[model samples]
Structure formats: structure tokens, C-alpha cells
Target: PSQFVDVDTLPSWGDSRSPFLYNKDVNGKVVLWKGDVALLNCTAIVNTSNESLTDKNPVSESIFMLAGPDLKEDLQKLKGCRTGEAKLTKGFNLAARFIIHTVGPKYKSRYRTAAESSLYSCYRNVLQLAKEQSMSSVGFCVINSAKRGYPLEDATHIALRTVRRFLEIHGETIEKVVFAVSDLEEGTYQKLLPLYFPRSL
Candidate 1:
């Protein structure tokens, strides 16, 4: 699907750029927070991951790792994951008040005909998950960009479009949806947020 929801720009929704960049050490990790206060108040945080939920790697592992000790017990108790289940629990080692997870479809590597469709599902389900969790705001990382092998350009654009579409359809139930991308993948979301949220709170 086209990444621009209601904008004219091709590479961007409009003239947009990163607003802030932080470079500091926090608990042995180089924490980065860009794009003003819009990012600060983000609710759900997205994790760019591989096929399986890792327990060691930083990207996927950190999500569960920071979710705290009861995660293992809690996860085992889940009957099974739904298409968009907003399962919630206390953050383990991280500061977040809640940890939300939504699995994006896997990459086929050779054939990508189902790429766009699968990508759409990722964002849609995640947003729906947030709504179920009663979150006022949510954050989403580039869903299928990294290990999933999606093109950065395609992923970034689709993410922006997905967020806008959800907001328009369900704006009353949400305060905001943050497109969270790290410095490594900053270009994926940095230049697109402003077009949708010019008067950001």
C-alpha cells in the first residue's frame, strides 16, 4: 500500500525531518530519543525482529527482557496469540508501564508478492492491539524493515500511511500513535511524522 495517506509527496508525506536526537549512555546501552516530546509520551513501542522471539539478541530479546520477571510465566499462560491481542503486564527491567507485542508476517525472501498485504496486517493488528489495551497513545517501529527483509523505503512509507488510516478510522479511541524508529532505522520514520502531526502535543 502507498505510504502517503493524504499527502502529495513521494519520498515523504511532506517536508519533514527529525526534530531531536539524543546520544547518551544508559545502563550500558546507547539510548536515543529523537523527535521532541511526541516520542517521549509514546505508549506501545515496536520492535524490529526476526522470525522467532529471541531471548538474547538486543532487538527482540530486549523487549521481553525488559518486560520483567513475570514475563515467562505470563507468556506461558497465554492460550495463544491472537491476530491483535493487547496482552499487558508490568515492565520488568524497562521503564515502560506496559509491554505490547504484535508479530509481523515473516519474509518469504524469494517471492515478495504478499509483501504489502502482510505489512498492512502488521500495522493494523498492532493498532488494534493498542485499542484493546485501552492505551491512549501507542508507538510502532518499522514493522517489517529489518530482519523481515522489507525495503526501507517501502516499510517507512507504508508505516506512515498505516498510522494515518488507523487514526482517521479510530481517532476518538486514541490520543496518538507514535512511529518509533531507532537511530539505526531513523530514516525510516523521521522524515514522515511531521506531515501527519504538525501541531503535535
Candidate 2:
């Protein structure tokens, strides 16, 4: 075998897209879940999921099936989450070794401090879980808005703000994070596309 002679080939770039929705491109810009997308994968994904672990829901049920039986044990009863608190599970379906479950606060506008806090909890607590577990990568989905009834713009702002803050604090230690989304959301959530993804801390 001989090498190429006076010829060159185009170079390739590694995959820039993340399976997680927290770090995906919306329209032309980057966005996090809660902001406008549900960046996830068949393996690891996030969403409002379901309220009861025993209830019927695609997001949660699908994840549970993929995560194996360990998820069922945790879903047996309440996980001690305060109202709208974030909860994590070790190896639940959805093809993830772990799942970060955050309960978003009900919509009540800004007057209800708890509402925003619950949404904030979704970001803060999830990052905390990833850091604590020494996870290298994770995915997320929109918390409320559609199902949870959170304000789209407000929820996106809260999600991006929290994620940016967390990355600022832990970017060095963390290796990679991802955001997963679908083509349908490409336009409607345009505001977040520019705001969610950023280069600097």
C-alpha cells in the first residue's frame, strides 16, 4: 500500500450536537431545555415526565423501561421531594444510568415567588446532582410551559440563567453537556435560540 501522492482530503469535525436537549441549537443559536427544547436521547433525556412514578406517561415510562428495574424501586413511593423540588434517580429507564427529576412549580406569574423558585430548582438541583455523581455528560428537557404551565420566555430565561451559572462555577471540572430537541421547535422558541447558548461564562 502507498500513501496519497500530492493529494489532500477534506478534514472532518467531531460531532458538535449533543443528545441532551440542554445544549442544542435552536433556530440558529444554542438553547437549553426549560428555555425552549427537550434535548434528550433514547438513552438519557429529561422532561416534565409524569407525576406519579406508577402513572402512565411516555417520558417517564419510557425512561423507566430503559433504566431497568432500579427505577421501579425508587418510584415505589414519594422520594421526599418538597413541593416542586428536584429529585434524581439511580438508573431509571430512558437508557440512562441515572435520571434527574425536577418538579416545576405551578404557574402563578412572578408574584408567586415559589413558582419561579420551583423552575429554578429544576436547573440548580439537576446540575448539583450531576456534579455530585461525577457524571461527565447529561441531557435535559423543557420543565414546564406546555405541561407544567410555566411562562415560555420566563421559563427559558430561568433555565438558561441557572445552567450558565452552574457552568461558570464548574466548567473546568465538567467535561461535556448536551441539549436535545426536535425540528418542530426550531421557530416558535426563537427568543431562546440566541439567549440559551453562549461562549463565555
Candidate 3:
């Protein structure tokens, strides 16, 4: 009844596909992946979670289910997280060695500034935590969009912009960042990745 897949059986980033953006300035790569984030063999896979860090959303639910009961037990020890903040846990049965859980703010037009700030912090905090852990690669799930109600375009913009800035400064250590999206989000990310993580022609 285990859903775990051996990390070695999965494709490495280098063997995945073309069209990744490599920033010579930072010595890092940004990948636009269209698939499940849980299957990625990166240093860590990010999970979008509620403040309680429970399995409230599909993304977190699947991760919890796949990672097994041990992951849930570990999460309980962390207690909870806050908006824009992130916490780390062992990947347990996942492909990645670790999982980083973060909460994104619900978007509201009237409180746009606060909401955007919190969303931005979600990306920043995750990247910083990854760097602290000395992780070489990280996979990110779309945060603040979908059921969270942040407009797709706006949320994508913040995600790409924040990641670009983080890579520029700390990319040496964090060699790769994968923006793992679903079929519904692939088009939006494909359109915007160039703006933030441009490739030389």
C-alpha cells in the first residue's frame, strides 16, 4: 500500500527536457516543469499548506498520502506555520529527501498590498530555508493561486519575480529551482518564464 517511488527511477533534471533557463551570473537553472511536484527528485519538494500544516488542500493531501503516516507524525511536532512562513520536515516516503511546507495568503483586491507581500514572503522564505539546509535543488508548487483565490497572472508574476531575485543572490548554492505546474497552469508559466528567467538566444 505504499505509494513511494524510488528517487533513482525518476529522471534527473538534466535529462528531463530542453528550454530550461540557465543564469550564468548566478550559476543556477530555472525549470518550467509540467507534472506532479511530489514525484520530483530534487533536494526538496515544496508543499502549499494551510497555517495548521494539515492536509487541507489537494497538493498537501496528496503529499501526505504519498509520504505516508510518518510524515504526518513529523508534521505534528512542528505544530503549525504562519502566513508567508515555511517549515521543514523529512520527506519520509517521498522521492525528495525533504519537504518544506509553506502557507500563502488568500488574495483580496482590497488588501492587495498585504496579500502580495505575504505571497512574496512565501517564496522568499522557502528559498532561504532551502539555502540554509544547503539543498542544491528545490521544486515549487504554485502558491496563492487556485483555491486560494489569487489571480493566476498576478500570482505567477510574484512567483517568478521572487524566485529570480533569490537565485540572483543565492543561486550558487541553490543550483536549480523547478516551477512544477499542472496542465491548467502550464500555459501561464510557459508564457511568463521567459520574462523572469530568460535564456540567451
Candidate 4:
């Protein structure tokens, strides 16, 4: 099944950059920490998921397979998550303690704004959910960046910008927010994040 495939090269962005803080606890660091989400050491990991909770996507499968069926069962109870919304559950067998499932809209030429808005909400909602749970550190992937058809450039901007906004408002409580990526996504973050916040240093 999807379990056997190594869809991503682990830590593909090795030593790309370090977590830089915007201010003294005013804004925690937004580090482009390149690695496997399931293997990340953090309070939580995000699943760029769909309502069906299927494993067709490598990212989804990796999270679910490592986290085990308890995650699946919990997701099933929710029946399905709404696009741009998030649901949380125990990480079960995964390395992290929590898993935040968020659905992102697929890229649609006829529905660009809608898709963009949905992706933004996906990050915003998951970060908000983690904040509510009193989690200090969280790691995220580039939501909808892969097979979902979201342009990497657009998705990357949205992902970084959304989290940057969250940190600007509520960075004191959340100590660290990590963008755990691999391969192309990793390369993009490495280049874009610094430009996104040149004043942070």
C-alpha cells in the first residue's frame, strides 16, 4: 500500500537555516527545519489532510502509518473535517504528542481566491488549534503544495505569511513554529523565508 513508499527524501534541506526570532519573545522563530514530520521533535505535527482521511498522499500516509490506527479511528469519529478547518487528536504511536489534521483546498484555476483562502485558513486554524491546546512548539508542512495542485510559490507564501501573522499576534505564548519540509518545498522555504522577514535578524 502507501505505507511502503518513501515519497520524500528525509531532511532534504539539511542545514538550510536556523530559527530566527523577530523580537525578545515578541515573535518566536520561524525556522525552515527540513525533515520528516513524523520524526520531528515538537509538541505537534500537522497533517495536510482531506475529509476522507485517506492515505493516497504520501504525507498523510506517513503520518497515519507512524501514528497508528488510533489516529484513524479518531478521525473517523469526526466523520470528516471541513476545508480550511482543523481537528486534533493524540499522536498515538508517532513521535510527537499531538496531530493536527487540516484540510486544504486544491488548486483550481476557476477558484483561485477560494483555494488561496482555504489554504490560509488551513494554517491559521491549525495554529489556532495548537495555541488553544497550550502547545508551545509545532511543525508544519507546505499544505496542499504537492499533488493537491497548489503552486509551490503561492502555497509557500501563504504558509509562511499565515504563520508570520499568527506569530506577530500571539508569539509570546507559542515558543517555536517550525516549517518542516523536504526537497523542493525545502529549497523554496530556504530562499523565501529570509526575504519574508529580512528584519528578523
Best by lDDT: 3
Cα displacement (angstroms), candidate 4, residue 163, comes to 0.8
Clashing pairs in 4: none
Give lDDT tens digits, candidate 3, residues 73-141.
888899999999998999998888899999998778899999999999999999989999999889898
The best-first sequence of candidates by lDDT reads 3, 4, 2, 1
Model 1 Cα lDDT, one tens digit per residue, 118-198? 677767777777788777656455555465556877666677667665665576766545444557667545555444333
What value of lDDT does candidate 1 attain over all alpha carbons?
A: 0.50
Model 4 lDDT vs. the true structure?
0.73
| Per-model root-mean-square deviation over C-alphas | 11.3, 9.6, 4.1, 5.7
| Candidate 4 Cα misplacement greater than 4 A, ranges | 1-28, 199-201
**Stronger candidate by lDDT (1 vs 3):** 3
Quote model 4's TM-score.
0.84
Question: In candidate 2, what are the lDDT values of residues 1-201, reduced to their tens digit?
Answer: 432111012110112232223432221222233222121331224545444534334454445555678666785655545545566666533445566765666676665678887778877877777787776555666656365567676776787667766775576545445444334333434455345453222
On TM-score, the leading prediction is 3
Instruction: Give the range where candidate 1 is weakest over 10 consecutive residues by summed lDDT.
Output: 22-31
Q: Please give the distance, in angstroms, between residue 63's alpha carbon in candidate 3 and its true position after superposition.
A: 0.7
lDDT of 4 by residue, 1-201 (tens): 332212233222222353544443433355666567777656888888777766367678788889887776787787788889988888898767888888889789899999999998999899889889999778787678477798888888888778777777887787667777788677777667764454435
What's each prediction's TM-score?
0.64, 0.66, 0.86, 0.84
Weakest lDDT window of 10 consecutive positions for candidate 4: 5-14
